[PDB]
Amino acid sequence: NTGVPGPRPEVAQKLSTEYQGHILRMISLAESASELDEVLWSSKKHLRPVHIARSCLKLEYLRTKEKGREVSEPIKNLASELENYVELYSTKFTIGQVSQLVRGLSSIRRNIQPDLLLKLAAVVVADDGRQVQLANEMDCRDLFFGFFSQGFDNELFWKRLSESVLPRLPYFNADVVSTVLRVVSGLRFLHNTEFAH
RNA sequence: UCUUGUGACUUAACGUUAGGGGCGAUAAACCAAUCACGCUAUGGCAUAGCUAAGUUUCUGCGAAAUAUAUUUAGGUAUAGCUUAAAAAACUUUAUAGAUAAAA
Ligand SMILES: [Mg+2]
Ligand SMILES: [Mg+2]
Ligand SMILES: [Mg+2]
């Protein structure tokens, strides 16, 4: 934390404490779904949108070792429990946090309720796509693949996102451009358009 | 062994002054076997935060010697001590980009 004036007060006025780092470390230290469940049970009353967003990615990391078997039972239970927090904080997420929520829940082959997806999509539909700029390159590639995997088909959502990302396409990394290209080929309403070209 | 031994002497009988007192060539001396207030009865089973003592058996539980205040310091009061696998809570501190399902 710093009090020096600067060009970006949005990312400089954020308050960072030791207690938040303590909880985030515990989540990352968990080595199994059983351990992660106990960590979340102890911290029930001290979970915030940042913690919820990070936990969803943890499920993705934990299931990578279970390459052969299907999704384990404790992983499914954690996903259901987390969704209760997502609904509670549906209007208190940032574009970066929403980006990693969808990716985490999509990697477990889980489907989000249509009402919840509509609420989360407001991050890019509101403020005429201003919040898209705040998102960095890593956030953008997860937004495209995450929402595409969820089966979310909304012309207004995809039209606004495409317009706000078009200027930055030439300067993204090659892999990120490839990810966007695959998503476009899967959506009929984006074929043979300026965005595709 | 020593002092005085006709004198401010010694002795016998009876009498006078009484304790908030008497008497005293003053030693606080004497006033019925030891007086800086006699003896006896009563108030009176005076008062003692001090010392001593406290009488048959069996079963169960079980301390303290610190703090504060005190005409208080070897007394007493208050607090402390002793008797009388539930619920709830998450604590010894700081951080990432790992998924690829469609001719
Ligand atoms: Mg004298
Ligand atoms: Mg005992
Ligand atoms: Mg006084």
Q: Cβ of residue A106 near strand B, that is under 7 Å? A: yes
Long-range pairs, A129-136, Cβ under 8 A, ≥24: A129/A160, A129/A161, A129/A163, A129/A164, A131/A94, A131/A95, A132/A95, A132/A161, A132/A164, A132/A165, A133/A164, A134/A10, A134/A94, A134/A95, A134/A96, A135/A95, A135/A96, A135/A99, A136/A96
DSSP state, residue A54: H
Q: How many CB atoms lie within 10 A of CB A76?
A: 15
Q: Cβ of residue A57 near strand B, that is under 7 Å? A: yes
DSSP state, residue A32: S
Long-range pairs, A181-187, Cβ under 8 A, ≥24: A182/A145, A183/A144, A183/A145, A183/A148, A186/A148, A187/A148, A187/A153, A187/A158
Query: Exposed/middle/buried for A162, CB within 10 Å: 0-12, 13-18, 19+?
Result: buried
Q: For A85, phi and psi rounded to 5 degrees?
A: -75, -35
Q: Cβ of residue A43 near strand B, that is under 7 Å? A: yes
Residue A68 CA, nucleotide B27 C1', distance (Å):
130
DSSP state, residue A189: G
Q: Which nucleotide is nearest to A99 (CA to C1')?
A: B97
Tokens of A121: 């999509």
Q: Cβ of residue A20 near strand B, that is under 7 Å? A: yes
How determined? cryo-EM
b/e burial code for range A87-108 (CB count within 10 A of at least 16 → b): eebbeebebbbbbbbbbbbbbb
| Residue A164 CA neighbour count, 13 Å, CB half | 24
Report CA(A180)–ligand 3 centroid distance (Å). 93
Q: At what angle do helices A18-29 and A33-42 cross, to 10 degrees?
A: 160
Q: 3-class DSSP state for residue A153? A: coil
Q: How far is CA A190 from CA A14, A40, A105, in A?
A: 37, 41, 25
